[PDB]
Design an enzyme around this catalytic site. Sequence first.
Site, PDB file in Angstrom:
ATOM      1  N   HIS A  40       0.823  -1.206   0.000  1.00 32.69           N
ATOM      2  CA  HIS A  40       0.000   0.000   0.000  1.00 32.69           C
ATOM      3  C   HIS A  40       0.861   1.262   0.000  1.00 32.69           C
ATOM      4  CE1 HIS A  40       0.087   0.282   4.595  1.00 32.69           C
ATOM      5  NE2 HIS A  40       0.180   1.554   4.248  1.00 32.69           N
ATOM      6  N   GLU A  52      19.184   6.839   8.640  1.00 31.39           N
ATOM      7  CA  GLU A  52      18.444   7.983   9.140  1.00 31.39           C
ATOM      8  C   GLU A  52      18.064   7.959  10.601  1.00 31.39           C
ATOM      9  OE1 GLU A  52      17.812  10.733   7.939  1.00 31.39           O
ATOM     10  OE2 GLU A  52      17.238  10.729   5.823  1.00 31.39           O
ATOM     11  N   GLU A  62      23.692   9.046   6.674  1.00 31.58           N
ATOM     12  CA  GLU A  62      22.706   8.747   5.643  1.00 31.58           C
ATOM     13  C   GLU A  62      23.254   8.228   4.331  1.00 31.58           C
ATOM     14  OE1 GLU A  62      23.079  11.837   6.991  1.00 31.58           O
ATOM     15  OE2 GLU A  62      21.192  12.360   7.971  1.00 31.58           O
ATOM     16  N   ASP A  84      -0.187  -7.545   1.835  1.00 32.66           N
ATOM     17  CA  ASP A  84       0.331  -6.181   1.838  1.00 32.66           C
ATOM     18  C   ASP A  84       1.845  -6.160   1.992  1.00 32.66           C
ATOM     19  OD1 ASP A  84       0.492  -3.439   1.781  1.00 32.66           O
ATOM     20  OD2 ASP A  84      -0.414  -3.120   3.757  1.00 32.66           O
ATOM     21  N   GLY A 175       2.219   7.013   8.845  1.00 36.15           N
ATOM     22  CA  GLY A 175       3.619   7.357   8.680  1.00 36.15           C
ATOM     23  C   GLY A 175       4.544   6.199   9.044  1.00 36.15           C
ATOM     24  N   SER A 177       3.636   2.977   8.340  1.00 36.83           N
ATOM     25  CA  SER A 177       3.367   1.966   7.325  1.00 36.83           C
ATOM     26  C   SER A 177       4.533   1.522   6.474  1.00 36.83           C
ATOM     27  CB  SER A 177       2.205   2.330   6.410  1.00 36.83           C
ATOM     28  OG  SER A 177       1.005   2.347   7.135  1.00 36.83           O
ATOM     29  N   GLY A 178       4.650   0.212   6.272  1.00 37.49           N
ATOM     30  CA  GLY A 178       5.748  -0.320   5.481  1.00 37.49           C
ATOM     31  C   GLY A 178       6.956  -0.664   6.331  1.00 37.49           C
TER      32      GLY A 178
HETATM   33  C1  LIG Z   1       0.531   3.554   7.676  1.00 36.83           C
HETATM   34  O1  LIG Z   1       1.299   4.473   7.863  1.00 36.83           O
HETATM   35  C2  LIG Z   1      -0.941   3.666   7.987  1.00 36.83           C
HETATM   36  C3  LIG Z   1      -1.327   2.459   8.889  1.00 36.83           C
HETATM   37  C4  LIG Z   1      -0.453   2.222  10.150  1.00 36.83           C
HETATM   38  C5  LIG Z   1      -0.957   1.132  11.109  1.00 36.83           C
HETATM   39  N1  LIG Z   1      -1.973   1.622  11.992  1.00 36.83           N
HETATM   40  C6  LIG Z   1      -2.199   1.069  13.126  1.00 36.83           C
HETATM   41  N2  LIG Z   1      -1.428   0.086  13.731  1.00 36.83           N
HETATM   42  N3  LIG Z   1      -3.259   1.344  13.960  1.00 36.83           N
HETATM   43  C7  LIG Z   1      -1.724   3.845   6.656  1.00 36.83           C
HETATM   44  N4  LIG Z   1      -1.312   5.055   5.933  1.00 36.83           N
HETATM   45  C8  LIG Z   1      -0.467   4.906   4.849  1.00 36.83           C
HETATM   46  O2  LIG Z   1       0.407   4.080   4.799  1.00 36.83           O
HETATM   47  N5  LIG Z   1      -0.701   5.845   3.716  1.00 36.83           N
HETATM   48  C9  LIG Z   1      -0.396   5.347   2.314  1.00 36.83           C
HETATM   49  C10 LIG Z   1       1.027   5.782   1.900  1.00 36.83           C
HETATM   50  N6  LIG Z   1       1.257   7.257   2.239  1.00 36.83           N
HETATM   51  C11 LIG Z   1       1.176   8.285   1.141  1.00 36.83           C
HETATM   52  O3  LIG Z   1       1.906   9.250   1.110  1.00 36.83           O
HETATM   53  N7  LIG Z   1       0.204   8.007   0.219  1.00 36.83           N
HETATM   54  C12 LIG Z   1       0.376   7.994  -1.260  1.00 36.83           C
HETATM   55  C13 LIG Z   1      -0.999   7.883  -1.948  1.00 36.83           C
HETATM   56  C14 LIG Z   1       1.239   6.785  -1.677  1.00 36.83           C
HETATM   57  C15 LIG Z   1       1.062   9.293  -1.732  1.00 36.83           C
HETATM   58  C16 LIG Z   1       0.930   7.699   3.656  1.00 36.83           C
HETATM   59  C17 LIG Z   1      -0.533   7.323   3.958  1.00 36.83           C
HETATM   60  C18 LIG Z   1      -3.172   3.967   6.969  1.00 36.83           C
HETATM   61  O4  LIG Z   1      -3.670   4.960   7.437  1.00 36.83           O
HETATM   62  O5  LIG Z   1      -3.893   2.859   6.699  1.00 36.83           O
HETATM   63 CA   LIG Z   2      18.905  12.693   8.620  1.00 34.38          CA
END
Ligand SMILES: *C(=O)[C@H](CCCNC(=N)N)[C@H](NC(=O)N1CCN(C(=O)NC(C)(C)C)CC1)C(=O)O
Ligand SMILES: [Ca+2]
Length: 223
Positions: A40, A52, A62, A84, A175, A177-178
């Site tokens: 995702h 970092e 870095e 995912d 933030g 995620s991944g």
């Molecule tokens: C991850 O950062 C979020 C879920 C974290 C886990 N939550 C929890 N344990 N309760 C996820 N947000 C997320 O990953 N997105 C997609 C990628 N990003 C972005 O910049 N989006 C683009 C479309 C690729 C530009 C950040 C936001 C979430 O909210 O499910």
């Molecule tokens: Ca730095």
Amino acid sequence: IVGGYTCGANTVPYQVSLNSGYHFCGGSLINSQWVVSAAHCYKSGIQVRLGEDNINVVEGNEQFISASKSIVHPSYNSNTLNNDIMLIKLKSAASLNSRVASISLPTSCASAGTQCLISGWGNTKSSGTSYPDVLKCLKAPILSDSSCKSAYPGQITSNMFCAGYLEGGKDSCQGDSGGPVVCSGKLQGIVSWGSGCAQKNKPGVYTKVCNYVSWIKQTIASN
Ligand SMILES: *C(=O)[C@H](CCCNC(=N)N)[C@H](NC(=O)N1CCN(C(=O)NC(C)(C)C)CC1)C(=O)O
Ligand SMILES: [Ca+2]
């Protein structure tokens, strides 16, 4: 990371930040030229940032390397978030040392109860927003699949596991995620999803990496 602590500069050497003009997701370095992240998190024009700590200040350790290719899992479903996971190849191999190192893939799946380390540069508040500039860490146990399924009826697949605290207060968040979920020095999960962050009875849901070792290894061997 909500309710965690400041890791300490470069104490999580395999943690990387995916940057497309700004940090948007975390990732885990698995070898000198490959990074595992969440499907995702896919987007074109990714620059992988390794070594970092403060993502807003160049501190000296870095390594910024552009990605040459990304490979989203063949069965990734963005609606259910099943499978995912994604692999990102660096244009050039990273220079590995104590502060920048790869994390090993698991040989076995971790069980419920295993304590793991979750890290990332995501939001630190469950209500509202506040982004840390330095890496945050959280020690959390893998939860039982029954409690995971009870928390998220009809949403947990065999390619997912919950980790955290049903009480709330500690969890990964936007933030993060991944990013990595490391247990006993092996990458067992990828920060995937959840309902809000650190909410009671809504623990974090993570991609079950052990299910993907063969795919990861075969994909790396041919790309
Ligand atoms: C991850 O950062 C979020 C879920 C974290 C886990 N939550 C929890 N344990 N309760 C996820 N947000 C997320 O990953 N997105 C997609 C990628 N990003 C972005 O910049 N989006 C683009 C479309 C690729 C530009 C950040 C936001 C979430 O909210 O499910
Ligand atoms: Ca730095």
